[PDB]
Design a binder for these strands. Structure first.
Ligand code: ZN
Ligand code: ZN
Ligand code: ZN
Ligand code: ZN
Lengths: 195, 193, 196, 192
DNA sequence: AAACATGTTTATAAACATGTTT
DNA sequence: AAACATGTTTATAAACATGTTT
């Protein structure tokens, strides 16, 4: 299984989320001390990338899902069959109906599965912020609820975004739990009460 | 052309269907069958004069709401592809309604309407019995995402002639779920408005 | 392959049967004819009647072997549970291997055997014709583990396979019957009868 | 010698035992009802600190005189089972085990053949009034081959580093399948 | 024999978790 | 959001099966 350990690296690589509009019906929200994303299915979710020094030639940013619990870590993460086949979300998407993770607003994006692992992930060429901007925004879409039967089956997962060299070297990586549900607002308020 | 009818029609042979926290339960006041997925479901048929020769009983599911009638009812992709319930089995894996215990049961998909249904040759009751029994199994919960997506359905059981002329028709709403008992009691308290 | 339980009267019209089952409510054993099933308490002796219409061969013998009733289990040797195999109780000064489920009492020539390859256990007795004026040869069998014995039969129904053989193991006839070793044969048998 | 004593003896340190479902304890019948191998929390209480190598021994013994002379052990079935016996420091025969303590030491008297398990005594956590020991019982009271439904007592003894008994408390233990059911049973049974 | 004892199974019912509708 | 809807998981109680005691 792939590594899920925070490694800032040579470019002080960092992933973060802008203000999570706590306005009750927020399409997504992020608990900072739970290191957890609560996101509605398919809704666009913006991620902030910061680097302390410019990364290499054609570096890239990959996002890969994986289960949190040890008993499952071995199993790939993809869209439950019902969602892989249904008409919605698939209309005419340049992504494979299997991949739980999609990127938005970036035609240079490229999806991929590994023959040896059969692990699914999406890659995007790194691109420095625009003038007077501190972050580089990547737009993500999560295609299955974390409770789809025949898929995540209510099994927690976590996103492992990593920065890499044009040819695979791991320049840095960060991770956060991701619960893609219907009421990120409620499911977060509640999780913050279990303690 | 139009969506299959759902109006009760006893017909020349006075054709009628009826039912005898168990596997299922049937509300007569709501004419609605509550039942667990894939569990066996006994339906009693009754005629007052013998149907013709190759007379058959066909069961077809159709959405209840006008908003959905035109869409064929089928199993959700999950279940249609799952090995569970489809291993040793002659029913095409997509058909919602199957009938167990009758080798002559034939499943059919309309070549033009795309609609699916299962027939069973008509056979009078056993001697000293007043009811011919048919055993249905329903293969998807009403709530199956990808399938019924919780849209209610009607079961249209129709007595026909060897060559598909309808001679009788009875209909009932079917709610395949995990807790027929609970849910039925819910619907019953709901009208206790 | 898992030993044959097919009824086969053979050339000598081999047949096993039971005398009065004395119901008594407290019998040490009882036998249902309609269920072909023997009910009997652990270790209590069990008289079984053998009949033949023509004398069997020379070294002709009678072997009794337990085997599981259900296909799902038929491949597992039937033996005593560890508890009873290790216990001093019943193994006191017996000539019989402590692991063997079926024993025979009142016969010095009785001989226990484990198949080197199959590892199956059985007990044989040299067949002897009945005493003068008696129609049946009698064989006293003992069953050393209840059925519900944990780590042993663990409530898995068995069948006993009594067989008539030639001195050299050729089967001359074979009969079978289920065998439920319990504490209240009277109750359990009535139970099975109401059940139907 | 004679069979191990079972009379409560608080002793110089006011040694006492108590209990705060997988288990339940009847105070009127001084009896513990609990499921097999499941974890059992027992609360030790003293009023002054015991000596140095002070230990807490737990030893099981038959309740009835008809059986006291017999050592209480696991039935051959469980003793030989892979179940509960895989990675274990406790001998597979020992009925009582202690979980959550690497210092726990199992002993079998060379002469009496009796088996128990000791745990070094350590005072409660700061702000806590009780030292807690976690015990596991590896056979059902009913195990054929073993207890064979014969009732047993648990003799928890506070001892000197060299085994001189300093304190002693006892309680009957019934390891069964439904502690709730059985306790209610005995309870209704005496209410008669 | 009748009543009890005691580990397993079966049945019922709440409590959960989480998506949709009012 | 507040309420509901609807499959799962947990908790409880009965019912069983079967050996012992009275
Ligand atoms: Zn999905
Ligand atoms: Zn389905
Ligand atoms: Zn045994
Ligand atoms: Zn045991």
């Amino acid at each position: 299984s792939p590594s899920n350990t925070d490694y800032p690296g040579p470019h002080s690589f960092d992933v973060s989320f802008q203000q999570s509009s706590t306005a009750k019906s927020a399409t997504w929200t992020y608990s900072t001390e739970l290191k957890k994303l609560y996101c509605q299915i398919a809704k666009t979710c913006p991620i902030q990338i910061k680097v302390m020094t410019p990364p290499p030639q054609g570096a890239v940013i990959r996002a890969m899902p994986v289960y949190k619990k040890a008993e499952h870590v071995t199993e790939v993460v993809k869209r439950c069959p019902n969602h892989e086949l249904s008409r919605e979300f698939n209309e005419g998407q340049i992504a494979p109906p299997s991949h739980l993770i999609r990127v938005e607003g970036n035609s240079h994006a490229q999806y991929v599965e590994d023959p040896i692992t059969g692990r699914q992930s999406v890659l995007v060429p790194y691109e420095p912020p625009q003038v007077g901007t501190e972050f580089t925004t990547v737009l993500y879409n999560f295609m299955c609820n974390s409770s789809c039967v025949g898929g995540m089956n209510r099994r927690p997962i976590l996103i492992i975004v990593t920065l890499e060299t044009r040819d695979g070297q791991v320049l840095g990586r960060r991770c956060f739990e991701a619960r893609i549900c219907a009421c990120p607002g409620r499911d977060r308020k509640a999780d913050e009460d279990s303690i």
